[PDB]
């Protein structure tokens, strides 16, 4: 809703857009008060509840920035905030583009160089470590919410409008964006940092292949695709889920919805999905193997068997 | 103190020895009351202090067996106990030999197959898991206290005569047999389940190479051997140590003691000379496993237990997951 050339807060001169995505306009400005240095300004919706979550996003970045004084854990750095025409405005460090758009600039299904993915994975885990340390769930990790500097060497985890503290975790199967939504959310089993880990694993595969790992059209389709990888969901797990019903029968069989309407029943699924295959189309192969193995250890259906952050950080794929 | 022939408790015919494990002789018997099924009877030593830890022993085994009904977690199964000529007697499921003896039947520095080692690794971590779930430290894990069945497919962690609760952590620099003793014990830092995981690491290496990992002649030598692997101990950690003064100077430099008359040499930095992969060494399937073992060992052998790999994480490690 803002115009180019507009000066905001008597210092920020808006010279362009990063875009409307998707709950707030983010603009590029130069800051008169600081030698015309570049900033991003996120302008939150004119909106009764959009601003509630904007004030949320403010607090989470404070704690996260307070907790990372030397900024070494790769979360977006918030500078300050103000109000303009009844909009809360957040001022961030300037960052060129998100990984969604770098991936598009790489072309249909191409992916990033394995060097890049390797470096990015380490930065994302450092980010997961900083989050857990603060007892925060980011709860929407994917390429679209990861930003990078102009040189594309440093990434930052951004958009904390979905974030929450670990404790208040509501029981909704629609937490996190679908493609990156972990099985313990869908099923209704209690969850924590592991969902952020699951999401990272989802986007690492996407960073390297250029493809969405689990393009499920619904929660049922998601669980299906997950179990096409790790076989069926563990039984003790299936049972702890407040929504297990919606997805399994008392014989703990998976009820898979189809096309008109169909509802097949499966007692076991049997892994169909070849990660290592997908991670290649046509010493370099060395690392791709490691990455596959890394993806295998973080995409475990039971959160409790999922690789820890420090072990991820310590994994062979990272250590080169 | 027993005679082959001697029947114990009106039911156990003692027919052979496994021996004087250490603090008590252990013999093989058949149980008349059960169609002569095989048992081991452990006879604790007269001493009033020794039978005091025998009660302790009985206690931890009952707890551990109690908390593991299906026996999924690889601790020695106690059947029952009686008394005999004033000795406490523990009756265990019968078990062939320890890993100390199987290692010797393999020959000098030969070690076991990597298949067996990874199988044993999982079983050992499973035992570590039960111990933590019962808030017990074992505190003497090493090949000698790990028994195995006839076919050597299965092992059991045994000899809970050094075990303790986690809460009453006596600051002694001599918990655990020296070669398997973690640096936090020696430095006098506060310690917990981490010391059993360290011990497991040492015996996995020793299980595969046939070699003792840290054959240190003194506590000070052990620290030296451990920093050869990992580098100098973290300052953050050296400070938390009640016995830091024995090993590190005011500047936190390691003081390495040697004989011939005792000389001391100070090292400010100590850079890793120990090459784990090259020790610890056939085909690419195996070789890949051995690299995995080497990666797993490196997480286990972190000088600071705070950084040391957890049990659940160890169980999920690639080396285990096959």
Count of all residues that appear for chain B in the document: 322
Report the distance separating Cα B149 and Cα A299, nearest Å: 36
Report the distance separating Cα B127 and Cα B76, nearest Å: 10
Report the distance separating Cα A312 and Cα A314, nearest Å: 5
B316 and A297 within 8 Å at the Cβ level: the answer is: yes
Report the distance separating Cα B213 and Cα B197, nearest Å: 15
Interface check for A62 against chain B (CB to CB < 8 A): the answer is no
Q: Are A55 and A68 in contact (CB under 8 A)?
A: no
Residue B60 has a CB neighbour count (10 Å cut-off) of 22
Give resolution, Å, one decimal.
Answer: 2.4
Interface check for B312 against chain A (CB to CB < 8 A): the answer is yes
CA atoms within 13 A on the CB side of A112: 22
Give B115's strand partners: none
Answer yes or no: is A37 a known binding residue: no
Comparing CA positions, the residue from A26, A87, A84 lying closest to residue A55 is A87
Domains within chain B, CATH numbers bracketed:
1-68+76-94 (3.30.200.20), 69-75+95-322 (1.10.510.10)
Q: What is the CA radius of gyration of chain A?
A: 21
Give A89's strand partners: A43, A82
Angle separating helix axes A284-298 and A194-209, nearest 10 degrees: 150
What phi and psi values does residue B312 have, to the nearest 5 degrees? -60, -40
* CB < 8 Å to B318, chain A: 293, 297, 316
Letter string b/e over residues A196-214, b meaning 16 or more CB atoms within 10 A of that residue's CB? bbbbbbbbbbbbbbbebbb
Report the distance separating Cα A238 and Cα A240, nearest Å: 6
* CB < 8 Å to A308, chain B: 310, 313
A300 and B316 within 8 Å at the Cβ level: the answer is: yes
A308 and B307 within 8 Å at the Cβ level: the answer is: no
Report the distance separating Cα B89 and Cα B66, nearest Å: 19
Q: Quick one: CA torsion of B286, B288, B292, B298, rounded to 10 degrees?
A: 100
What phi and psi values does residue B50 have, to the nearest 5 degrees? -75, -45
Interface check for B309 against chain A (CB to CB < 8 A): the answer is yes
Residues 242..301 of B with a Cβ closer than 8 Å to A: which? Answer: 295, 299
Report the distance separating Cα B136 and Cα B80, nearest Å: 21
B316 to chain A, closest Cα gap in Å: 7
CA B142 to the chain's CA centroid: 3
* CB < 8 Å to B317, chain A: 311
Give the contacts of B259 (CB within 8 A, at least 6 positions apart): none
Q: Which of A194, A292, A309, A311 to substitute to test the interface with B, most B CBs within 10 Å?
A: A311
Q: Are A274 and A228 in contact (CB under 8 A)?
A: no
Answer yes or no: is B20 a known binding residue: yes
How was this model experimentally determined? X-ray
Residue A194 has a CB neighbour count (10 Å cut-off) of 24
Q: What is the residue-wise DSSP string for A59-102?
A: HHHHHHHHH-TT--S-BPPEEEEEEETTEEEEEE----EEHHHH
Q: Which of B316, B317, B319, B322 to substitute to test the interface with A, most A CBs within 10 Å?
A: B316
Comparing CA positions, the residue from B46, B35, B208, B42 lying closest to residue B116 is B208
A310 and B307 within 8 Å at the Cβ level: the answer is: yes
Report the distance separating Cα A85 and Cα A87, nearest Å: 6
Residues of A annotated as part of the active site? 140
CA distances from A199 to A69, A101, A193 (A): 26, 18, 10
* CB < 8 Å to B316, chain A: 297, 300, 305, 307
What phi and psi values does residue B99 have, to the nearest 5 degrees? -75, -20
Interface check for A310 against chain B (CB to CB < 8 A): the answer is yes
Interface check for B122 against chain A (CB to CB < 8 A): the answer is no
Chain breaks in chain B (C to N over 2.5 A) after: 260, 281
What phi and psi values does residue A70 have, to the nearest 5 degrees? -90, 10
A307 and B316 within 8 Å at the Cβ level: the answer is: yes
């Amino acid at each position: 809703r803002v115009n180019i050339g507009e000066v905001l807060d008597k210092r920020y001169n808006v010279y362009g857009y990063t875009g409307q995505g998707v709950f707030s306009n983010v603009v590029r400005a130069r800051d008169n008060a600081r030698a015309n240095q570049e900033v991003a300004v996120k302008i939150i919706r004119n909106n009764e509840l959009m601003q509630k979550t904007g004030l949320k996003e403010l607090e989470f970045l404070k704690k996260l920035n307070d907790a990372d004084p030397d900024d070494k854990f790769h979360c977006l750095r918030l500078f300050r905030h103000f109000y303009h025409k009844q909009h809360l405005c957040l001022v961030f460090e300037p960052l060129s583009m998100n990984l969604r758009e770098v991936l598009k600039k790489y072309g249909k299904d191409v992916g990033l160089h394995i060097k890049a993915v390797r470096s990015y994975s380490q930065q994302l885990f450092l980010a997961l470590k900083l989050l857990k340390r603060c007892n925060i769930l980011h709860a929407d990790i994917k390429p679209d919410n990861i930003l990078v500097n102009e040189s594309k060497t440093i990434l930052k985890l951004c958009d904390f409008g979905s974030a929450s503290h670990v404790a208040d975790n509501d029981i909704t199967p629609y937490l996190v964006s679908r493609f990156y939504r972990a099985p313990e959310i869908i099923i209704g089993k209690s969850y924590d940092y592991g969902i952020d880990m699951w999401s990272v694993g989802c986007t690492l595969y996407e960073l390297y292949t250029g493809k969405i790992l689990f393009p499920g059209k619904t929660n049922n389709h998601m669980l299906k695709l997950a179990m096409d990888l790790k076989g069926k969901m563990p039984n003790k797990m299936i049972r702890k889920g407040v929504f297990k019903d919606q997805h399994f029968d008392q014989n703990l069989n998976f009820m898979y919805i189809e096309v008109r309407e169909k509802v097949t029943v499966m007692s076991t699924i049997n892994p169909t999905k070849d990660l290592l295959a997908d991670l290649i189309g046509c010493d370099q192969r060395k690392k791709v193997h490691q990455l596959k193995d890394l993806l295998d250890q973080i995409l475990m259906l039971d959160p409790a068997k999922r690789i820890s952050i420090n072990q991820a950080l310590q994994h062979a794929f990272i250590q080169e």
